[PDB]
Design an enzyme around this catalytic site. Structure first.
Site, PDB file in Angstrom:
ATOM      1  N   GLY A  24       7.005   3.725   3.372  1.00 38.08           N
ATOM      2  CA  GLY A  24       7.500   4.048   4.201  1.00 38.08           C
ATOM      3  C   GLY A  24       8.457   5.252   4.437  1.00 38.08           C
ATOM      4  O   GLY A  24       9.033   5.950   3.147  1.00 38.08           O
ATOM      5  N   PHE A  34       5.568   6.266  14.323  1.00 38.35           N
ATOM      6  CA  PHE A  34       6.308   6.571  15.433  1.00 38.35           C
ATOM      7  C   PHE A  34       7.927   6.008  14.858  1.00 38.35           C
ATOM      8  O   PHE A  34       8.949   6.010  15.575  1.00 38.35           O
ATOM      9  CB  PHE A  34       5.983   5.390  16.805  1.00 38.35           C
ATOM     10  N   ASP A  37       7.864  13.377  13.861  1.00 34.92           N
ATOM     11  CA  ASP A  37       7.033  13.670  12.995  1.00 34.92           C
ATOM     12  C   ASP A  37       5.684  13.506  13.091  1.00 34.92           C
ATOM     13  O   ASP A  37       4.937  12.614  12.250  1.00 34.92           O
ATOM     14  CB  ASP A  37       7.944  12.439  12.507  1.00 34.92           C
ATOM     15  N   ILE A  62       0.794  -1.117   0.048  1.00 30.68           N
ATOM     16  CA  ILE A  62      -0.461   0.431  -0.556  1.00 30.68           C
ATOM     17  C   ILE A  62       0.283   1.540  -0.051  1.00 30.68           C
ATOM     18  O   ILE A  62       0.269   2.534   0.144  1.00 30.68           O
ATOM     19  CB  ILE A  62      -0.665  -0.363   0.686  1.00 30.68           C
ATOM     20  N   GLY A  98      10.754   2.152   5.216  1.00 26.67           N
ATOM     21  CA  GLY A  98      10.241   1.137   4.593  1.00 26.67           C
ATOM     22  C   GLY A  98       9.272   1.063   3.912  1.00 26.67           C
ATOM     23  O   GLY A  98       8.964   1.642   2.744  1.00 26.67           O
ATOM     24  N   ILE A  99       8.663  -0.328   3.732  1.00 25.55           N
ATOM     25  CA  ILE A  99       7.156  -0.307   2.835  1.00 25.55           C
ATOM     26  C   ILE A  99       6.154  -1.116   3.877  1.00 25.55           C
ATOM     27  O   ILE A  99       6.420  -0.886   4.846  1.00 25.55           O
ATOM     28  CB  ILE A  99       7.763  -1.665   1.370  1.00 25.55           C
TER      29      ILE A  99
END
EC number: 2.7.11.1
Lengths: 11, 294
Positions: free
Chosen positions: B33, B162, B143, B30, B36-37
């Site tokens: 990130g 996080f 963030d 989806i 990562g993914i």
């Protein structure tokens, strides 16, 4: 630049 | 700096043992990130969707962040924080299995429609409730932005992502690391000064600007240029200032304060009368993509 990515620039 | 082997061994002690491909199937990517993914997967036994974040240990600038995310997700649960079910090591990847939140991210709302002040107050209240608890334990998210705010099917806020968090202590009360998302970063953090939980409050202010204006300040500038303006200039103004109430402007004025020592804390902000406007979760539902017209 309209980028929304989180980034680590320096410690 | 400890070796990959030693870092992995440390992480292995805190994650769940085993291979999650024994339990999960039907993986669908989806997103890309922050470290990562992200995929969705179905849990074999229930057919229920979960979200799974996959991060390669060898491709991280700050590996410690992987460890932070797992430990903070394990130890600091809150009604307004996304739940981590389990975490695993699969070769040199960390997999974090998260609840799937059917409402999606706040970004999708702020870029496609216009929130009212009751809706804005509801989101702020929920984020502030989470931050007050997290900040009290020294946890800094680092963030905050609409992308990190996820919504349940019934309109509840869950602070997420996080991957960049930190924890301060009596022994090491401040961080110095330049991390976050350029347009949302606090001026002290961009300045590479010792900072604490206050950085999250600034970032939340920028998210308020998102909720009013649709985008953060300076969004069309190269990132390092935007960061220079946040660092050096008066706090950013609402482009749609003319649309907002005295209560909202007064609230935002307590978040977008350049000196972190003068900036309001989450605990103080929970008592700001702007938040008396907050609607219930039913008020957020109609904003969500699955309910939107047009």
């Amino acid at each position: 630049r309209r980028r929304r990515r989180s980034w680590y620039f320096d410690g | 700096r400890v070796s990959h082997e030693q870092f992995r061994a440390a992480l292995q002690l805190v994650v769940d043992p085993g291979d999650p491909r024994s339990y999960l199937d039907n993986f669908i990517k989806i997103g890309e990130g922050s470290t990562g993914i992200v995929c969705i997967a179905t849990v074999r036994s229930s057919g229920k969707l979960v979200a799974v974040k996959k991060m390669d240990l060898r491709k991280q600038q700050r590996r410690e962040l992987l460890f932070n995310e797992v430990v903070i997700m394990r130890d600091y649960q809150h009604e307004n924080v996304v739940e981590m079910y389990n975490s695993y090591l699969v070769g040199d990847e960390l997999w974090v299995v998260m609840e799937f939140l059917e409402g999606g991210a706040l970004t999708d709302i702020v870029t496609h429609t216009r929130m009212n002040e009751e809706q804005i107050a509801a989101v702020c209240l929920a984020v502030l409730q989470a931050l007050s608890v997290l900040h009290a334990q020294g946890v800094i998210h680092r963030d905050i932005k609409s992308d990190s705010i996820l919504l349940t099917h019934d309109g509840r806020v869950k602070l997420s992502d996080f991957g960049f968090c930190a924890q301060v202590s009596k022994e090491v009360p401040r961080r110095k690391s330049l991390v976050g998302t350029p347009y949302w970063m606090a001026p002290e953090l961009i300045s590479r000064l010792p900072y604490g939980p206050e950085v999250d409050i600034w970032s939340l202010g920028i998210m308020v600007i998102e909720m009013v204006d649709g985008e953060p300040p300076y969004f069309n500038e190269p990132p390092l240029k935007a960061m220079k303006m946040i660092r050096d200039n008066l706090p950013p103004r609402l482009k749609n200032l003319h649309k907002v109430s005295p209560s909202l402007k007064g609230f935002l004025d307590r978040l977008l304060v350049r000196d972190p020592a003068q900036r309001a804390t989450a605990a103080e902000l929970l008592k700001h009368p702007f938040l008396a406007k907050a609607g219930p979760p039913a008020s957020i539902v109609p904003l969500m993509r699955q309910n939107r017209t047009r």
